[PDB]
Amino acid sequence: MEDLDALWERYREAVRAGNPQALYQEMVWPALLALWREKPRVYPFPQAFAVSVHTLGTSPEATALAILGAGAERVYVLHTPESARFLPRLRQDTGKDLYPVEIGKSDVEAIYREVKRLLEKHPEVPVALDLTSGTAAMSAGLAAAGFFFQRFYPKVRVVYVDNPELRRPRAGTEKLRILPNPHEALAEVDALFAKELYGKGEFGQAAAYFRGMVGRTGNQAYALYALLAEMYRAWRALDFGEALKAGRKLLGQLSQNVWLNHPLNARREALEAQVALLEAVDRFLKARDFALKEGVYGLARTLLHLAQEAKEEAAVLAALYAYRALELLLQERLALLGRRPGLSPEEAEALRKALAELLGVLPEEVRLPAKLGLLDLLAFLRLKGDEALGRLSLAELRGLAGALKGRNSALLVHGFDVPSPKAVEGIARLAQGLLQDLEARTALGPLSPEPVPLGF
Amino acid sequence: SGRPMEDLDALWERYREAVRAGGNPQALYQEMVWPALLALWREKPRVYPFPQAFAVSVHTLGTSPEATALAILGAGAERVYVLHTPESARFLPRLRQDTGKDLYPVEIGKSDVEAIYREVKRLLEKHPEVPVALDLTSGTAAMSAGLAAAGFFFQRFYPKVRVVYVDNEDYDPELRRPRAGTEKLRILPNPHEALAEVDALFAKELYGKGEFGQAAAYFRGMVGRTGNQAYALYALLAEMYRAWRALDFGEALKAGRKLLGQLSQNVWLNHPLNARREALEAQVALLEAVDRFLKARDFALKEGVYGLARTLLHLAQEAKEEAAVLAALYAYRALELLLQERLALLGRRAEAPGLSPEEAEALRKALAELLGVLPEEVRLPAKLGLLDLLAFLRLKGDEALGRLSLAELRGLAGALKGRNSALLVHGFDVPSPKAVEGIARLAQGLLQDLEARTALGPLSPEPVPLGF
Ligand code: NI
Ligand code: NI
């Protein structure tokens, strides 16, 4: 290599005192070609390649250096028809046999189709995609194809050959370089992945990206976003204790002064309403007293939100969520009458009567269980004059009577019913109106239903 | 006349002749051709494949300010950013004058690709919901690739970004330059958009992660975009698994059968899924059994019981970490089913035990000893619970339950009685995944004994590999 820097000053001597190029090809080229033909190095970290793919549009020189530097045994050269005249000198200067593929100067999709094909033929080995020579469109197209296909062919790399008195760079300072894709090159991009996952309800994955953000920049503003996603993850999983824990710790940090400007403080109102809702639900889970109207509302709203998200692609699960919501809501109506349970035969016959007319059956052979079912309970609330439940017409109540009778015969409780998503809708709508009443009997802050905007 | 293609075409012919007469191309092009070419683009900006409105354009600038000036005019944006090497900063006043636009320059090293990435990130945050053109016409090969790479990556988050370049076909072997009025500003397509069948890679990736609904959407979406009906068969396979994981066994069976019916035909004799027809037939047979049992509710059909409980246990495994409350519901329903299968070997129903006073007495004593307290005081319900069922089997000599360590049982009796107190059944229990695991581990053991007593096909636990 020291022969080069010696040879560079001599080329500079001979360029002074008058054909700048023809001295480079004569006294420099197979001197630089020599160095690359025995000790070629790939930056920033070296490696070899089974296969290499080159665009050819300008001149064989820099390409030939890249073919050497990649050291692959299988070489493909994508050339413009113009550039075919350079293949002999390319073959010669590299020593290798080449698979030539002709592409139009701007047939970018031809590049796309070729890379797809070559990756399919070599799906499991390192492949180098070299964009050093060609039109802007060709180099760009090959880079685009590589980074795109890296998602499915992780061993793909995108490479290019990197280069005053003379109109040229110094002949020893060329390196073969790997072009970094955007993920590996931008530290803060994981914040975009996290926000996208957040918006999809992938809260667990959003939290992991936000936590990793902290380790990649040191910026603790991302720790608060991790708590936020963890709160929603735990909440959606019905782990109310963990959600309250994380929500508390988040509200803690947003009160402190260093975080006065954090984008989440722009929605403190809705956040505080939400952490209070988790508090109420968590207390109600421990005390199990339907006198905690807030805890009942938040548990039932959460179950109904989950039922609506599962309705289409998880109907058996949605039936289960909606049954539990409707169950809690009716049980809260029973608490309004202080009876959460203890029937006088004055009622155990009157209820047998109303059930009998509702379903068009004789009172005897209506089996009134010790534990009132959904249908039993709903009818009992009308008999004892519940206002919202008395508002139902007899037709729509007869339409619900099948689904209401299936509360325990559902497949994920004790039976084998596949639900009618129309019956799942019936229960959820009935639960929805009850929930709206209970909302009027609690104070729950601003309370956006869905998660807060992240504000970036 | 006055920036028309007609003016330009004549000037080119005049330029054609003045170089055969030994004029120098560079200064002749800059004086003869160039001002007419610019005027054309100031009048009817030459844009393709389909004309488009950009609020922002972003241009790399390495060497020739001329093509960048055309690109700036063609994109027609209000806000223009120029990412220039330090060398090309001197071109900026000419570029501003040739385009009539007030540029915002940003200096970038000629091989600092990470700077392109950062600058595009900065500019997209500043312009988050408007059409943006990223023009790669001028720069080093690394500059152009980098801007294109940034454009396509960022499209995931900024769908209104487009990558563009000035396309220039050459006509003359005589005049090295391209023909003066044939430059067109072009959109560079995303490889995802441009390759009809790369959706198959997306589906396969989604399929191997268990995202069957989304795998099926990509397979179906491909049938339209390419007419290739081999991908409709893969959609059916993805739909089968998605219904199966959703416990929609009837729908799962419909899809499996429709898939076996296609695979049996001659057209699809070499479809890759025929390489795994034996496991497909086992799996569809399993779905048959579960569908029959769900209707019959007869525990004699061991295959249906096995299939249902295996599915429930698989769903418990997957929810065990992030969905403990759900995992418990799945595990309980599996254990309840497996216990009730045992009791059908003796001949009893859990809902209608038909106890005699001796068995009713014996069971109460049996349970009494386990709870080791208030013996003969806690009372047995009309339909036997989980512990109840366990005892009445363990009492009558159950092989799988008789092989149960009572201290391992000792630490399960709490779990074994929260079957209805679960938050998602009737009560308010948060689950200790340690409780789920015990229930799950117990039901696994029963399930394995039941597997012996069935005619199990291949039935690889996992879904069938795609074969491509
Ligand atoms: Ni939602
Ligand atoms: Ni699995």
Numbering used by the authors:
A (entry chain B): 1 to 18, 20 to 164, 169 to 345, 349 to 464
B (entry chain A): -3 to 464
Pull text from the paper.
The T59A or S60A single mutation did not have a significant effect, but the T59A/S60A double mutation and K137A single mutation abrogated cA4 cleavage, consistent with their conserved roles in cA4 cleavage. In the previously reported structure of apo-TtCsm6, residues N416 and H422 are coordinated by a Ni2+ ion, which may cause a conformational distortion and hence generate an artifact. The Ni-free structure of TtCsm6 is essentially identical to that of the Ni-bound one both in the overall structure and in the R-X4-6-H motif. Thus, Ni2+ ion-binding does not significantly change the active site arrangement of HEPN domain. In the apo state, N416 and H422 of monomer-1 form hydrogen bonds with H422’ and N416’ of monomer-2, respectively, and the guanidine group of R415 is buried inside the domain, where it is stabilized by E332.
In addition, Csm6 proteins also possess cOA-degrading activity as an intrinsic off-switch to avoid degradation of host RNA and DNA that would eventually lead to cell dormancy or cell death. The two TtCsm6 monomers dimerize in an X-shape, and each monomer contains an N-terminal CARF domain, an intermediate helix-turn-helix (HTH) domain and a C-terminal HEPN domain.
